[PDB]
């Protein structure tokens, strides 16, 4: 696996890294997971999650209004734009951040946490010294090569996926409602999901941006065996190279 990881690599114009956790017996196959790669999109499910964790000592909190103002609407708000002038709940703003990425919605469960920093202390909170978030969005999308800011390691980010969708770090109303919303996902086809049994069940976040930076992060529910956590994030060395969903698949299928 790992020669075919680099050889993918190496014909793709870029730097892969991958890591796979299978939760049968926590064996990993690892490709550069302990580099940072700028996460884009997928740290989203950070944020939504730090909201869910703040819902487990706050009844009401999910069910908040917040007020969507048409200067609030940044690139891309496929949901949020439906609500301009109107509110949306904090959990219809989970579920379009995660099941749509929508910048509007992420920016609000930021805004509501306090701010980037808040999110990087939540992250803290359950074990992870490695993410970190740094900008709203879009900008945090720019995937520098280089820029710490907005970044994990590959390694980090399955760790921390694990522990929030099949391990310790959120109890279970809101485990359960971060696999729901990953379930639903409508913007993964492509990416992992692409190289995976066709009936796999699988939750997944997705991240695009400059660099082509082209990002995956996914929960996989095989038929007859247990989870798999992978993480696939690609990275090239062009600020305007063309993203590469494919590639992620591709590595989905080499590790699977
Ligand atoms: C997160 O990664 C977001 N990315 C951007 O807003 C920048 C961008 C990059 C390329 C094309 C359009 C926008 C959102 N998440 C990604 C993703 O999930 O792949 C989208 C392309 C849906 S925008
Ligand atoms: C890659 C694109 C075709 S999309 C990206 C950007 N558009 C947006 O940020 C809005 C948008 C976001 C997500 C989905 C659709 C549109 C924008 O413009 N971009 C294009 C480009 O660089 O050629
Ligand atoms: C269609 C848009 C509203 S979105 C597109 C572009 N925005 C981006 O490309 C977002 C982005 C930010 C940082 C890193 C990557 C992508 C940008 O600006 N764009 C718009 C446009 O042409 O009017």
Known sequence: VQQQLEALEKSSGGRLGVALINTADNSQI????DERFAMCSTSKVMAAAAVLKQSESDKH???????????DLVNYNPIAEKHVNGTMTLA???????????????????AHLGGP????????????????????????????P????????????????KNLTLGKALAETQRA????????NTTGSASIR????????????????????????????????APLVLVTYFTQPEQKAENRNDILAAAAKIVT
């Open 30 to 33: 690892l490709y550069r997971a």
């Open 61 to 71: 909190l999910l069910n908040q209004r917040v007020e969507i103002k048409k200067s």
């Open 92 to 110: 219809e703003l989970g579920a379009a951040a995660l099941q749509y990425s929508d910048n509007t919605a992420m920016n609000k469960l930021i």
């Open 117 to 144: 920093d808040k999110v990087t202390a939540f992250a803290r909170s359950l074990g992870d010294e490695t993410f970190r978030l740094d900008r709203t969005a879009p900008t945090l999308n720019t995937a520098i």
């Open 146 to 161: 280089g820029d710490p800011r907005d970044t994990t390691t590959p390694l980090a980010m399955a760790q921390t996926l």
């Open 177 to 184: 409602q971060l696999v729901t919303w990953l379930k639903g």
């Open 194 to 225: 692409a190289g995976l049994p066709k009936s796999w069940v699988v939750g997944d976040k997705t991240g695009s941006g400059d660099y082509g930076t082209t990002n995956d992060i996914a929960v996989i529910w095989p038929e007859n065996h």
